[PDB]
Amino acid sequence: EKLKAALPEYAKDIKLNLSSITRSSVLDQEQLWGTLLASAAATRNPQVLADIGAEATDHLSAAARHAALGAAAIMGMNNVFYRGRGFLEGRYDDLRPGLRMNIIANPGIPKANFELWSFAVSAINGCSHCLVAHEHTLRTVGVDREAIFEALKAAAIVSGVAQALATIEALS
Amino acid sequence: IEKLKAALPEYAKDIKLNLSSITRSSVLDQEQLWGTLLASAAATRNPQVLADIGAEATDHLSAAARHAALGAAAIMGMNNVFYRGRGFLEGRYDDLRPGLRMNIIANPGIPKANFELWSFAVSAINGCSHCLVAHEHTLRTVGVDREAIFEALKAAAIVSGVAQALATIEALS
Amino acid sequence: IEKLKAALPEYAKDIKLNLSSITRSSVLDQEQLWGTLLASAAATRNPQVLADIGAEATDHLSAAARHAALGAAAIMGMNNVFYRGRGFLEGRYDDLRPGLRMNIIANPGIPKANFELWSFAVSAINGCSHCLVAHEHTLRTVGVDREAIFEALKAAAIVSGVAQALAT
Numbered sequence: 475e476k477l478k479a480a481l482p483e484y485a486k487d488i489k490l491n492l493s494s495i496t497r498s499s500v501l502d503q504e505q506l507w508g509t510l511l512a513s514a515a516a517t518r519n520p521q522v523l524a525d526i527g528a529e530a531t532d533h534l535s536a537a538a539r540h541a542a543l544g545a546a547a548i549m550g551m552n553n554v555f556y557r558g559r560g561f562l563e564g565r566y567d568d569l570r571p572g573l574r575m576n577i578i579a580n581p582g583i584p585k586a587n588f589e590l591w592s593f594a595v596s597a598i599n600g601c602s603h604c605l606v607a608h609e610h611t612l613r614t615v616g617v618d619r620e621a622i623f624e625a626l627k628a629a630a631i632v633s634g635v636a637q638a639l640a641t642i643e644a645l646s
Numbered sequence: 647i648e649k650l651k652a653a654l655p656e657y658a659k660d661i662k663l664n665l666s667s668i669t670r671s672s673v674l675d676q677e678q679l680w681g682t683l684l685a686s687a688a689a690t691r692n693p694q695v696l697a698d699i700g701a702e703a704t705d706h707l708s709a710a711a712r713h714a715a716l717g718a719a720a721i722m723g724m725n726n727v728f729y730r731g732r733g734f735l736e737g738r739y740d741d742l743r744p745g746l747r748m749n750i751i752a753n754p755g756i757p758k759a760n761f762e763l764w765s766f767a768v769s770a771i772n773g774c775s776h777c778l779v780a781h782e783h784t785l786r787t788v789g790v791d792r793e794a795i796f797e798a799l800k801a802a803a804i805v806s807g808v809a810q811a812l813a814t815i816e817a818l819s
Numbered sequence: 820i821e822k823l824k825a826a827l828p829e830y831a832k833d834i835k836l837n838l839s840s841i842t843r844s845s846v847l848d849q850e851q852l853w854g855t856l857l858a859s860a861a862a863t864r865n866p867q868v869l870a871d872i873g874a875e876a877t878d879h880l881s882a883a884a885r886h887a888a889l890g891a892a893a894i895m896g897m898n899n900v901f902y903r904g905r906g907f908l909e910g911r912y913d914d915l916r917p918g919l920r921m922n923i924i925a926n927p928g929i930p931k932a933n934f935e936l937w938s939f940a941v942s943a944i945n946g947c948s949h950c951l952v953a954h955e956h957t958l959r960t961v962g963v964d965r966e967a968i969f970e971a972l973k974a975a976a977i978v979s980g981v982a983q984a985l986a987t
Contacts, residue, residue, distance in 0.1 A: 482716070482720075483713075484713045484714070484716050484717030484720065484750070485716075485717060485720040485721075486749075486750065487721055487724075487746075487747040487748050487749055487750050488720055488721065488723075488724060490747045491724065491746055491747055494745070494747075515983065515986065515987040516983070518691075518864070518865075518983070518986050519691075520986075523986075523987065540829075540830040541830070543828070543830055543831075543987045544828075544830035544831055546983055546987055547828075547830070547831040547834055547980055547983045547984035547987060548831075548833060548834065548980065549983075550834075550979045550980040550982065550983030550984070551834060551837065551976045551977055551979055551980030551983075552976070552980075553979075554943055554944055554946075554972075554975055554976040554979040554980075555943075555972060555973065555976035557943070557946060558943035558951055558972045558975070558976070559972070561943075561948040561951045561952060562951070562952070562955060565965075566965060566968075566969050566972075569965065569966070569969050571973070572973070573833075573837050573973065573976070573977070574833040574836045574837055575833050576832075576833055577830070577832070577833055597727055597728075597730075597731035598727055600727075600730055600731075600773060600946055601946075602734040605731055605734050605735070606734060606735065606736070609735055609738075619738065619739060619742070620742075622739075623739055623742050626728060626731050626732065626739070627728065627744065627745070627746060629727060629731070630724045630725070630727035630728035630731070630746070631724055631746070633723050633724055633726075633727045634720055634721065634723040634724030634725075634727075636723070637688070637689070637691070637719055637720050637722075637723030637724075638720040638723065640688075640691045640693070640696075641688045641696060641716055641719060641720065643693070644693035644694075644696040644697050644700070645696060645697065645700050645716075655886075655889075656886075657886040657887070657889055657890035657893070657923070658889075658890060658893045658894075659920075659922070659923070660894055660897075660919075660920040660921055660922055660923050661893055661894065661897060663920045664897065664919055664920055667918075667920075691864075692864075770900055770901075770903075770904040771900055773900075773903055773946055773947075775907040778904060778907045778908065779907060779908070779909075782908060792911075792912060792915070793915070795912075796912050796915050799900075799901060799904045799905065799912075800901065800917065800918075800919065802900055802901075802904070803897045803898070803900035803901035803904065803919070804897055804919070806896050806897055806899075806900045807893055807894065807896045807897025807898075807900075809896065810861070810862070810864070810892055810893050810895075810896030810897075811893040811896070813861075813864050813866075814861045814869060814889055814892065814893070816866070817865075817866035817867075817869045817870060818869060818870065818873055
């Protein structure tokens with residue numbers, strides 16, 4: 475509400491879209507808020523992370539909250555590494571990453587949910603390798619594409635929100 | 647942009663030179679140029695760059711222009727993520743209704759040409775091939791020269807270099 | 820570091836470990852390593868990471884090297900947008916001259932090997948295939964082993980994770 479209220483007039487579709495995604499009935503209240511929170515972190519916009527984070531506490535456990543934020547952090551690294559490896563046409567695929575990412579195997583919350591949040595973040599960062607790998611995993615654990623698609627929509631909407639908000643604050 | 651140029655460090659002279667050059671270039675309208683420097687400045691998320699350019703854009707852009715430019719950044723902010731992502735997913739989601747409102751695109755409050763140019767510029771900054779191509783095609787359809795489009799791409803890239811350059815000094819001083 | 824390593828949240832434990840190790844790693848020499856971490860920190864746009872890494876990098880980076888690293892991030896901030904953009908336009912704009920000044924590339928004020936390594940690290944962060952490839956090539960051209968290049972990519976990625984973790 476207060477976030478929506480801070481959105482400029484030249485950003486009406488974003489506000490509109492933020493309202494519709496927040497009232498989503500496709501994703502769990504945990505799937506939804508965990509996605510919104512991981513997405514918010516992935517935008518790097520403090521205000522957006524603060525307001526989504528504040529509202530998220532009344533919809534997510536401390537464990538869920540931490541898992542959502544850690545998905546953002548770990549994809550921040552993976553999204554750069556794998557995309558780069560992919561740009562090198564596989565010529566370094568034999569080397570050996572050597573990077574820890576245990577949170578992925580042991581998230582502390584349902585893995586279907588962690589994957590959903592990781593997928594959303596990979597969409598924001600733009601790494602096809604990770605977006606595809608996570609999308610495949612979601613399907614393997616029973617998440618339907620309607621829900622996977624809703625996460626893609628949410629990640630995009632939240633990116634718009636952060637862009638819209640960043641501009642108003644710097645100008646006003 | 648006079649203060650921005652001054653803010654740049656000697657190790658970023660090329661960007662300063664490029665900023666000086668793109669601003670004095672005449673291949674683009676006074677509206678196309680400042681509207682592109684503005685949507686680009688917005689898309690880079692650097693506060694100082696947006697603030698400086700935004701201020702210098704008022705005596706160079708109409709009210710409706712300044713509005714359409716900032717609105718292009720915001721809406722591309724979402725579209726550049728959505729279409730890019732769906733585009734990676736092997737056609738598996740091409741038959742689903744996005745259900746995303748983007749009316750500003752059909753009604754920017756100014757003739758479409760410039761909105762599309764600024765949308766194109768933003769899509770370059772965010773890195774979305776689907777949108778870059780779509781908007782480039784639309785620009786052509788409504789009579790915009792390649793030279794103009796290419797100049798926007800350059801302006802988008804230079805502003806991005808300026809944001810990076812200034813972001814680092816702000817943080818280190 | 821230390822203060823940087825210590826700021827990481829607990830749910831970002833893996834990134835803490837990765838930072839601790841990439842900084843203790845020898846694969847890259849101290850200038851290569853810290854110039855890459857500095858260039859990367861800049862590209863993440865996170866002010867705290869840039870400050871901590873920039874300060875720790877004073878003990879291993881000459882004045883010329885530090886400016887080369889920061890300069891690499893700035894120029895790649897522009898090139899990474901330009902070449903990627905042109906690259907998606909299906910060669911339809913390849914006949915036009917960019918006319919963008921890039922003099923720092925040929926003249927970084929230090930050995931190119933390092934400048935190219937840092938530019939490669941930034942290109943990975945911004946996501947421009949055209950530049951990551953062009954620099955990976957040059958890097959191999961003048962020497963530099965895949966292991967060093969791979970270590971920079973890892974460093975760029977690890978630094979991106981730190982910045983995000985801190986931003987959260």
